[PDB]
Design a protein around this ligand. Structure first.
Ligand SMILES: *P(=O)(O)OC[C@H]1O[C@@H](n2cnc3c(N)ncnc32)[C@H](O)[C@@H]1O
Ligand SMILES: [Mg+2]
Lengths: 522, 340
């Protein structure tokens, strides 16, 4: 059928379709071209997704779920997860060392969801939005991820797609999608573009060389836990503290109070992008008492200035990685809802010595637009011509070797897909196994890098220590996802080396159950 | 793959513009999307030929034609590069032949050659066991063979591999190198019996009865080993083989034997010994495939598996030149001049 492009955002999602040589961004049942990444369960047992879910947040906060994009592919322990918990009204519980969501689904029946299942529901709503417009069922999608998403976050997004009953034909990096939206109609030849992508919860900077349908990522750098959500948290925390200073009342107890403040903080932040102060008014805020405060643009900026200034570091990083001057940048492309913030536009403009950003780029829709184009290409039946993406892996991949050493195999900014092989050996006589610990990061010791996964390699034949020649191969596919394989390079019996997948990610049996659970609401 | 096609089309457009770095990236992307993409292999060959890399151009045209034997553009291209590659490969053999004659031109009053040849012998045992993962140092190997004393805190297996190699080389140099007549299966078994004799005296000097793997290579079923070894030794003693350049003869002898992999173990050690028997019978010094070349060695063997043995022949040729260069450098005499 029709392959759709879905921007699966932290706060909002957007679906587009490529038909008759152009992109249509599809309005949902409420006429909105962007859909809140929200799900909710009513006391009656009705599953709400999108606007309906977000609009009952303040009356049912404990059983309203959002921010799933900042939970997928992370540990329970993650300081970033613990930060968000303080501002999330729903129970986040540790299950297999990962943050699961526990909600009352109705009739005093509690269900515990993987963050992948929440994102699956959001993807289901975006699919339903497309199906309503197309008047035919949608089975295939291109889904976007932040460029700086690690292996686990990418796989979790694919898994969310699978659970939503979608064939995810391709995971596309959000800034690369944005570059396609900018570059498709342009026939200007070779250009260097800086895509600055500050969305609801993730920040990416990608430097691309675009050239008459070729989209070449030169360098990428970002932060998968920096965006609109963090700016809202800073303002919420400010006003929760101000309330305790004024009244003595700690409002962190009342979830309805905290989430009422969240809703009004979002409205205020949006207002402050076109005016210099916003009134925050809440009736029956805490213990039947009213809230009334002014937020100035200056105060909003002060509360977030460290975070705003921090967005310049990845811009500096991609220029350094690419060995390009500021003057080599032909276009600055601002995408993600948070690039509407005047101070963000000002910091980028001043970094590039007064250079204005590209005109006619809707920062809320550009990522979905690009996803829709790539969906059209992979559909194979949309006459899209010779569009070629040459994307890169965002993180250096390595294997832990004796002494907790980061043995680097694939450097950051390597074009994907890619393959790297290296021969390793045993640390003791007749060692029958490798515990292959794959790390993401730059540090020479793995303790200072991020564990991608643990892979059990079995069937190493008996031999003295350091004698076996076990080739370990890293393959990064076109989705940016790692496969680990191994081969004895020596003479051996017919029984090849076996690698068992990491046991700490969702198995096919777990995904099958989550798929079957999701199908019931079809 | 429509994706692969798009990448090749863009590769050709960027090449036309003179954006050769981008063209190369796009060719490589096309061949990642479809490794057996015949149009992409052929056009990437043209790209190599434009950069005056005739061997790589010909490699790609030949690879294309193994997939699609009647491919018009690949046939025309291969027909052009075939004689050019023969000229290039033969020129390298001529350079190697000159350097062999340079080694033989060393005066018999040269003091350095005697000691260098002795050192090189122990270097040969080090490299042939080390390339297979043996952890013994050159000094440890010298100690094992000169003294016969066991090195402490090292496996019996690794030491028994070295003792076996010493026994095998002594047998070859004293019985086979100077012997008149055909090289038989029985001769190869006698070499293997010494190679593996101290590690595995049960398997030493007999063909495997089980299926083995050799890295990525799947050798014949054990029941087919005798017949393939008979066909191998027929080729070894053929006038066709005798008419090859000794480097090509020795390289093909090595490859043909490890392809069969007739033994449970020691196929590489035995094949490298046979390679050097052939070179030494042809009047060449024995050559070394260095421990550090392990990864390159496996790559060109895999290239041979995939249907082009020439990268392996060229690899063995370069090992031969390196051996000759090292021998000539090590035996250089530095002249004393009168001020005048
Ligand atoms: P086993 O220890 O008996 O033999 C090892 C030798 O086999 C050769 N070899 C390695 N990899 C290949 C491939 N891919 N194809 C053919 N022969 C191969 C080398 O000579 C090893 O030393
Ligand atoms: Mg072996």
């Amino acid at each position: 059928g029709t392959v759709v492009g879905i921007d699966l955002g932290t706060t909002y999602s957007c679906v587009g379709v490529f038909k008759n040589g152009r992109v249509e961004i599809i309005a949902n049942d409420q006429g909105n071209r962007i859909t809140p990444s929200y799900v909710a369960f009513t006391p009656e047992g009705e599953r709400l997704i999108g606007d309906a879910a977000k609009n009952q947040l303040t009356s049912n906060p404990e059983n309203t779920v959002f921010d799933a994009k900042r939970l997928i592919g992370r540990t329970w322990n993650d300081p970033s997860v613990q930060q968000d918990i303080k501002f999330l009204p729903f129970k986040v519980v540790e299950k297999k060392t990962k943050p699961y969501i526990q909600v009352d689904i109705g009739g005093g029946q509690t269900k515990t969801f993987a963050p992948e299942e929440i994102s699956a529901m959001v993807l289901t709503k975006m699919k339903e939005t497309a199906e309503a417009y197309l008047g035919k069922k949608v089975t295939h999608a291109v889904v976007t991820v932040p460029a700086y998403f690690n292996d686990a976050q990418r796989q979790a997004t694919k898994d969310a797609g699978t659970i939503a009953g979608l064939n995810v034909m391709r995971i596309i990096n959000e800034p690369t999608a944005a570059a396609i939206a900018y570059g498709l109609d342009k026939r200007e030849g070779e250009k260097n573009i800086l895509v600055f992508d500050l969305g609801g919860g993730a920040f990416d900077v990608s430097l691309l060389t675009i050239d008459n349908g070729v989209f070449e990522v030169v360098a990428t750098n970002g932060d998968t836990h920096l965006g609109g959500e963090d700016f809202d948290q800073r303002v919420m925390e400010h006003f929760i503290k101000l309330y305790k200073k004024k009244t003595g009342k700690d409002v962190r107890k009342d979830n309805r109070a905290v989430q009422k403040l969240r809703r009004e903080v979002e409205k205020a932040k949006r207002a402050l992008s076109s005016q210099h102060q916003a009134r925050i008014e809440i009736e029956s805020f805490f213990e039947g008492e009213d809230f009334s405060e002014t937020l100035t643009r200056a105060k909003f900026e002060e509360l977030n200035m460290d975070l705003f200034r921090s967005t310049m570091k990845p811009v500096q990083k991609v220029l350094e990685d690419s060995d390009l001057k500021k003057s080599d940048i032909d276009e600055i492309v601002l995408v993600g809802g948070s690039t509407r913030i005047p101070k963000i536009q000002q910091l980028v403009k001043e970094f590039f010595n007064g250079k204005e950003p590209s005109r006619g780029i809707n920062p809320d829709e550009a990522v979905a637009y690009g996803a829709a184009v790539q969906a059209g290409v992979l559909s194979g039946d949309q006459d899209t011509g010779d569009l070629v993406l040459l994307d890169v892996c965002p993180l250096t991949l390595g294997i832990e070797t004796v002494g907790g050493v980061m043995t680097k195999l694939i450097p950051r900014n390597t074009v994907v897909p890619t393959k790297k092989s290296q021969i390793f050996s045993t640390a003791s006589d007749n060692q029958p196994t490798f515990t292959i610990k794959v790390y993401e990061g730059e540090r020479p010791l793995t303790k200072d890098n991020h564990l991608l996964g643990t892979f059990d390699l079995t069937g190493i034949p008996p031999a003295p220590r350091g004698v076996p020649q076990i080739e370990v191969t890293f393959e990064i596919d076109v989705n940016g996802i790692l496969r680990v394989t191994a081969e004895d390079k020596g003479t051996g019996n017919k029984n090849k080396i076996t690698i068992t997948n990491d046991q700490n990610r969702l198995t096919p049996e777990e995904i099958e159950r989550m798929v079957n659970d999701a199908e019931k609401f079809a | 793959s429509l994706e692969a096609r798009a990448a090749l089309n863009q590769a050709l457009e960027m090449k036309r513009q003179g954006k050769r770095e981008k063209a190369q990236k796009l060719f490589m992307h096309a061949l990642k999307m479809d490794p057996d993409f015949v149009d992409a292999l052929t056009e990437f060959g043209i790209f190599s030929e434009e950069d005056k890399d005739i061997i790589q151009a010909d490699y790609l045209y030949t690879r294309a034609l193994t997939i699609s034997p009647y491919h018009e553009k690949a046939l025309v291209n291969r027909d052009r590069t075939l004689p050019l590659v023969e000229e290039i490969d033969q020129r390298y053999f001529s350079i190697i032949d000159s350097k062999v004659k340079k080694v033989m031109s060393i005066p018999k009053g040269n003091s350095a050659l005697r000691r260098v040849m002795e050192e090189t012998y122990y270097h040969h045992i080090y490299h042939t066991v080390a390339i297979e993962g043996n952890t013994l140092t050159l000094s440890e190997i010298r100690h094992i063979l000169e003294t016969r004393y066991a090195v402490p805190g090292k496996s019996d297996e690794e030491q028994n591999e070295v003792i076996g190699m010493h026994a095998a080389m002594k047998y070859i140099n004293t019985t086979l190198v100077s012997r008149i007549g055909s090289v038989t299966i029985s001769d190869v078994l006698e070499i293997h019996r010494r190679v593996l004799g101290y590690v595995d005296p049960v398997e030493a000097g007999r063909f495997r009865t089980t299926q083995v793997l050799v890295g990525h290579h799947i050798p014949p079923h054990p029941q087919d080993v005798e017949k393939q070894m008979q066909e191998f030794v027929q080729w070894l003693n053929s006038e066709e083989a005798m008419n090859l350049h000794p480097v090509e003869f020795a390289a093909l002898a090595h490859y043909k034997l490890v392809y069969i992999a007739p033994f449970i173990d020691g196929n590489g050690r035995t094949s490298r010994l046979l390679m050097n028997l052939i070179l030494m019978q042809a009047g060449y010094p024995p050559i070394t495939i260095r421990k550090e070349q392990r990864s390159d060695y496996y790559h060109v063997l895999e290239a041979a598996n995939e249907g082009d043995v020439r990268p392996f022949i060229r690899f063995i040729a370069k090992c031969t030149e390196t051996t000759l260069d090292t021998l000539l450098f090590a035996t250089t005499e530095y002249s004393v001049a009168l001020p005048e």
